[PDB]
């Protein structure tokens, strides 16, 4: 908002795995849901980049656990396609929705089949 | 397209009668194995017919099918791109720091 | 009968058949410029039908290629878990 | 037996009495020629009046149809004969009867053009 | 060969076909509007034919009556000789 | 009426062209049984129509015949009617001078 | 034997020096595994620059299909190492070959987005 | 010409085989070659009614043997059509032309063959 080059700088070290760097941008106020043009927010981003203790901090941080990308993609989509198990069961934990879904319709089970994924799938059913 | 009343010179007033009414009865014949043979087509028309909105759908679900694919696969790509460039960075160190 | 006589039932049934012609020629115009149409559609199945097999092989040849990327992925995924383990170890 | 045979003269020939003798001895009314003729073609074929109508008294078939498929009624069409005519009606001779070509009287007289023979065969009965 | 080569080769061999396409489908249209004016004098054959044999049979059927004729008349112009020349005896 | 070049969303340039080129040959084909069965009806067509001239003709010839004869069949006609009536006359003479 | 089952093995994790034990015990340098791979498929399929090499000289099929039809040339190009790539068109690998979806190399690269594997790709030889 | 009701008078002696009627009409300039409307001459008449003599005395008097009536027809194809023998004969030595024909194209010889008349066929060979 009045200046988000703070959130520019906290993506670019979402991904980057820079968890100091994360916890000071933070502290500076730094927008915890902030978005590349792409639509990605932070979390997202560790999700994509496998970055579990971020994400831990993220959404510590109340980050949305279901912000969407520009093509609807969730983290949870992320992690589930890049198959980080680990960001998954802490995405749900969290309460990621398991239903949720991207623009072509794929929710996260439809990527664990389709990548034939067979432990993310039973993780992912295991839940209501 | 059949003969004309009285095509006749002489006087024909009973025959062509009874010869037009039998060329008009059999014509009505033709006509008939007509509507058979045009139903009986229109028939196996629409069987051809509804294989229509099946193709129409097969092509639109695979259509819709590829690009979510391909969004994922390219989205892969990145990653492998990614991956890829982080062993040269590991591999790149244990000359370094053999 | 009397020839007075039959040469009207000739005719009365001669108005018959010529009538019943034109309706059942009128019916044959309407099953012909209908099997018309449904002849341009039938055109559109050949093409509609090849394109559909394009679209198929399409997508299929992408997932054997996702499916090919998910794993070599996966792979690296590890070699890099590996050395960085190794990499870690090396202090 | 040629009883017939000289019966198709008296009748062509107009002999009135010896077609009653050939009755008597019981010569069939529907003897035939080469030509397909009953006695009563020949006689209406004449201009035969007297003669048809003992042969149509002694049951001669009214409708007979000669090789051409003509009938006494034609012939005394086709001549002129209107009173032959007149009483083959009378005795109920089939006016739309057709011969081989699909002729009826009517026609044969519309086709000598016969303003009368056709203002009384249009007395359809 | 060159890979380079073989898709010139084939689009070389596509030229053929579907240049040759066109002038086979030309020739097909010439057939088809062809065949069509074919078609247009074909109907008038069972139109033609029939009125041929109405003609026929209608000089067919004169020829009867007039050969019927010129015996009446070879018969009468007989009777007429005869009655006469009893006739004329009958001074 | 066939497949339009490149209907592909994905990279398929030889084959693209290897189909396409399959398709075309085969549609060659197609058309030449076309231009086959199409020249061999014409053929059949040509069979028909030569009898047209003909019937022209059987017609041409039986009405003029067929006046001809009319104008004969009148003329006897009168003839007849002529000699009918003569007799009329000596008969009708044999009632008086008999 | 299994002598090949050991070199596929050798030649997926990138046992440079094993490959060669192997190639002097004799092994085929065109064992398939189950899905069709030949060592000089899973030498590309791993960016195994070298070992891709001493197969190709020791008269390895540089155009081998695996059960799907997929090259080494093709696992080389979907998986963008570009240097196999240049040493398998080196040794006259056909760069037109297709797999069973009738993908070819350029194709995949294209796919992918490859903006430099396909400018040279495009040095057709 | 001037005043033809005697070639009236002298067609309709010719028709009713009035012998002594014609030789009078003749004297008094008759023409014989007069037409009725139907484009008669008195040699058709005499022809169409079987009056030889007065054929005979007709030709005599320079009535063309070859004259046509509106349809074509001459007084050959008369005598022909109705079986007048002797008088064809009569009309053929005067120099009827035998080839000569009405407007359906019926020459006298197509005229006996149509009747069938074995005789006048036989005796129309019989000429150049």
Known sequence: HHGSDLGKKLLEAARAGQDDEVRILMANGADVNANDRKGNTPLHLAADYDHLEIVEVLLKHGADVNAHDNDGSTPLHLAALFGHLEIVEVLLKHGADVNAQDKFGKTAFDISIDNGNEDLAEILQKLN | ?98
Chains 1, 8 share one sequence.
């Open chain 2, 1 to 98: 397209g059949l003969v004309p009343r009285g095509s006749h010179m002489a006087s024909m007033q009973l025959e062509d009668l009874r010869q037009q009414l039998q060329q008009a009865e059999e014509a009505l014949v033709a006509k008939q194995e007509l509507i058979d043979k045009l139903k009986e087509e229109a028939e196996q028309h629409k069987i051809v017919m509804e294989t229509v909105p099946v193709l129409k759908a097969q092509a639109d679900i695979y259509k819709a099918d590829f690009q979510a694919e391909r969004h994922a696969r390219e989205k892969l790509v990145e990653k492998k791109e990614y991956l890829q460039e982080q062993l040269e960075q590991l591999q790149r160190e244990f000359n370094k720091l053999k």
